[PDB]
């Protein structure tokens, strides 16, 4: 059976990056070629594997996170980046295998007055940990005093919104984000070409 | 956090050769495409080379093509530029820079598109 990219690529519906989806690709074949087709992926590159080949390959198993985030964000969806969707909301590992693909869906994602719907954290305390997903809503403390769930000076909601426009300037668009992580175990591989 | 330091620079008569050298820290090199861009001060910078991730695929700005030739050894985290028949023409500061490895070549020329860069080595060829 084929491996369901489509399934991934082609949703009506992105998670917001705080809250990035994940998919489990085992036991099928990964045809990358229709990947390959389509022209509008802005960012297309990988680590420790060359895009070209991916038909080649096999692994045990592939993993497929996508998000939402803003354009000038997708340069953070690397190893080894800092910003505060690196920082807080999607870390890759230093040593990651895999491949990041993005694209440019202002169509879908931005709204006349303003989509609110899509999220990041903008406030935590350290960083994340690498596919660390971090769904807390708890009211951030800035200060010394606690809290106790309720927002005030010092106590800060900690997810906040983009104001995602349809004329936004095109760094300050939402971009759709698909990463491909490649895991090989000794074990038997799952996801051939 | 990735550190890109170039060493191999100087001073080399119209037609020597000299051999750069960019080391990155850390242990992940052999994950990341590497690319040498080159600015004269007063001009733009520019795209030199390439190498993927496992020396296979390697490009080439055109003036550069059957002088220059990037290599890499993945046991010591290194990439180097050799440089051959040397031109007043190549004189600039060399910049070593490390990215992910590209579906579209043409990526490769773009310095941003890259992840991390490297502080630069001086070069000038003289007659």
């Known amino acids: 059976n084929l491996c369901p990219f489509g399934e991934v690529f082609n949703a009506t519906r992105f998670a917001s990056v705080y809250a990035w989806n994940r998919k489990r690709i085992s036991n099928c074949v990964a045809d990358y070629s229709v990947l390959y087709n389509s022209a509008s992926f802005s960012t297309f590159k990988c680590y420790g594997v060359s895009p070209t080949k991916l038909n080649d390959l096999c692994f045990t198993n592939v993993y497929a996170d996508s998000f939402v985030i803003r354009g000038d964000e997708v340069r953070q969806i690397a190893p080894g980046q800092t910003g505060k969707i690196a920082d807080y909301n999607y870390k890759l590992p230093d040593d990651f295998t895999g491949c990041v693909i993005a694209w440019n869906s202002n169509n879908l994602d931005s709204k006349v007055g303003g989509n609110y719907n899509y999220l990041y954290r903008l406030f935590r305390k350290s960083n994340l940990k690498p596919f660390e997903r971090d769904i807390s809503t708890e009211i951030y403390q800035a200060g010394s005093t606690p809290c106790n769930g309720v927002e005030g000076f010092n106590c800060y909601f900690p997810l906040q919104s983009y104001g995602f426009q349809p004329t936004n300037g095109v760094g300050y668009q939402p971009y759709r984000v698909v990463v491909l992580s490649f895991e090989l175990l000794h074990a038997p591989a799952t996801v051939c070409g | 956090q990735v550190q890109l330091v170039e060493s191999g620079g100087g001073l080399v008569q119209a037609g020597g050769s000299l051999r750069l050298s960019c080391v990155a820290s850390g242990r992940t090199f052999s994950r990341y495409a590497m690319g040498w861009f080159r600015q004269a001060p007063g001009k733009e910078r520019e795209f030199v080379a390439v190498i993927e991730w496992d020396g296979g695929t390697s490009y080439y700005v055109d003036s550069v093509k059957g002088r220059f030739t990037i290599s890499r050894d993945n046991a010591k985290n290194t990439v180097y530029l050799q440089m051959n028949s040397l031109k007043p023409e190549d004189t600039a500061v060399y910049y070593c820079?490390?990215?992910?490895?590209?579906?579209?070549?043409?990526?490769?020329?773009?310095?941003?598109?890259?992840?991390?860069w490297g502080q630069g080595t001086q070069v000038t060829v003289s007659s």
């Open positions: 820079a490390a990215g992910g490895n590209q579906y579209y070549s043409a990526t490769y020329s773009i310095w941003n598109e890259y992840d991390f």
